[PDB]
mmCIF file of C-alpha atoms in Angstrom:
data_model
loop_
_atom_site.group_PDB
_atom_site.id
_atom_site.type_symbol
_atom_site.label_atom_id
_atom_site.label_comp_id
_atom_site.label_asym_id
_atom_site.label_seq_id
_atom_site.Cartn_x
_atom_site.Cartn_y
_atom_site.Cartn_z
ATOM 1 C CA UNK A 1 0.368 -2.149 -26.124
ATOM 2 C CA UNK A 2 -1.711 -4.891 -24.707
ATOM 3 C CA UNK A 3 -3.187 -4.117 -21.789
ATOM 4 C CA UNK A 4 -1.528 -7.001 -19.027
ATOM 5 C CA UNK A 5 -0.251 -3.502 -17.588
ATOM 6 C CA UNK A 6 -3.506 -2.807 -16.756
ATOM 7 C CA UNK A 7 -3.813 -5.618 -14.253
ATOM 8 C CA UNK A 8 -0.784 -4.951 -12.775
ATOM 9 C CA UNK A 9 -1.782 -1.560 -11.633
ATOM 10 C CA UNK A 10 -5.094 -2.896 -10.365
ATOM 11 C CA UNK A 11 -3.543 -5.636 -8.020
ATOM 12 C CA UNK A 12 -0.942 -3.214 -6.451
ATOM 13 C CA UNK A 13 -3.842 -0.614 -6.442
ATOM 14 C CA UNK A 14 -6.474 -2.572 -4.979
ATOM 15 C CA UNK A 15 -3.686 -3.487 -2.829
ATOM 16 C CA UNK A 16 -2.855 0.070 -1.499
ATOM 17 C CA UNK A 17 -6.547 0.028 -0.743
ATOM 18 C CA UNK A 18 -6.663 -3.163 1.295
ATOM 19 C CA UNK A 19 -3.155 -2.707 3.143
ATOM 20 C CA UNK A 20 -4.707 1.193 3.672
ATOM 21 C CA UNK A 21 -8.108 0.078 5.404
ATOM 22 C CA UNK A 22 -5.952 -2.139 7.614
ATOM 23 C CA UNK A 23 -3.691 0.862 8.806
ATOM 24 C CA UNK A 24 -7.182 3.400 9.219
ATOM 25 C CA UNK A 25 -8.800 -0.135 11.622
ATOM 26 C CA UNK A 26 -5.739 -0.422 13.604
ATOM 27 C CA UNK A 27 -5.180 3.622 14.230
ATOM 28 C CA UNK A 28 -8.771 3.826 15.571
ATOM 29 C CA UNK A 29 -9.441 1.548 18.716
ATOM 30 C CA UNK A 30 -12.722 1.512 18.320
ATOM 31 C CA UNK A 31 -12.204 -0.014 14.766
ATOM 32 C CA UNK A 32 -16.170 0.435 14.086
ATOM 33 C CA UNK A 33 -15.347 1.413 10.707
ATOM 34 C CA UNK B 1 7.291 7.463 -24.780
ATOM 35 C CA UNK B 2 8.387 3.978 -23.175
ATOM 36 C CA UNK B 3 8.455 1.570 -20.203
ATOM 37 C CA UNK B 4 5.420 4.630 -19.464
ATOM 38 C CA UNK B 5 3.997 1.394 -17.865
ATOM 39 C CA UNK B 6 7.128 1.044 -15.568
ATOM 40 C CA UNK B 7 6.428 4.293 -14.430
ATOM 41 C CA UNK B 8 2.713 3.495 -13.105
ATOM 42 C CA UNK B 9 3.794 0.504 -11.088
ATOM 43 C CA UNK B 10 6.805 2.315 -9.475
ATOM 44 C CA UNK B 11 4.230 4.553 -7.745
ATOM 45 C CA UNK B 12 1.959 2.261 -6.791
ATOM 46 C CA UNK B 13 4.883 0.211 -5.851
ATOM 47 C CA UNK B 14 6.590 2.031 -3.945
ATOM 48 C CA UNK B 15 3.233 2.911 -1.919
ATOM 49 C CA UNK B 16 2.583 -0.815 -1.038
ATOM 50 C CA UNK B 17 6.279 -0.454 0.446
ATOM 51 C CA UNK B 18 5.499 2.972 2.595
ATOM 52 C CA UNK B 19 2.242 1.871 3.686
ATOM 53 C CA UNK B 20 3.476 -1.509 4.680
ATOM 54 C CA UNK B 21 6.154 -0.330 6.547
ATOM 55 C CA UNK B 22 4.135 2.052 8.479
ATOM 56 C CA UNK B 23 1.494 -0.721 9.482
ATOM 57 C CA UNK B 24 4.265 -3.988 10.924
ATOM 58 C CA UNK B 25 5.701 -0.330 12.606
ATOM 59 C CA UNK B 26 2.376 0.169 14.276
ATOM 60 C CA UNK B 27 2.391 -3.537 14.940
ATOM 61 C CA UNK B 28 5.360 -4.042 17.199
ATOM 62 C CA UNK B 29 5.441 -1.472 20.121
ATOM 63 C CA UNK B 30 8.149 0.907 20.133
ATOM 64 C CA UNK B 31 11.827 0.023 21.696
ATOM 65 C CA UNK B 32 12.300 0.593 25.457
ATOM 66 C CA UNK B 33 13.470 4.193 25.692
#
């Protein structure tokens, strides 16, 4: 069908990314990376 | 064969949810023993 389910998938994907990266910082003091 | 969209965003969803629980969890310190 047309593809507006695509972009839904890609904001709450790109959003497991960004909310992930967040967690990783904050577990590691050091936060270099 | 339908809502196969529905399915997609459920997971990735539902993974927003997990992950943002885990990180306000890490944000406040845990209750006093």
């Amino acid at each position: 069908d047309s593809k507006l389910c695509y972009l839904l998938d890609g904001i709450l994907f790109i959003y497991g990314v960004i909310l992930t990266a967040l967690f990783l910082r904050v577990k590691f003091s050091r936060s270099a990376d």
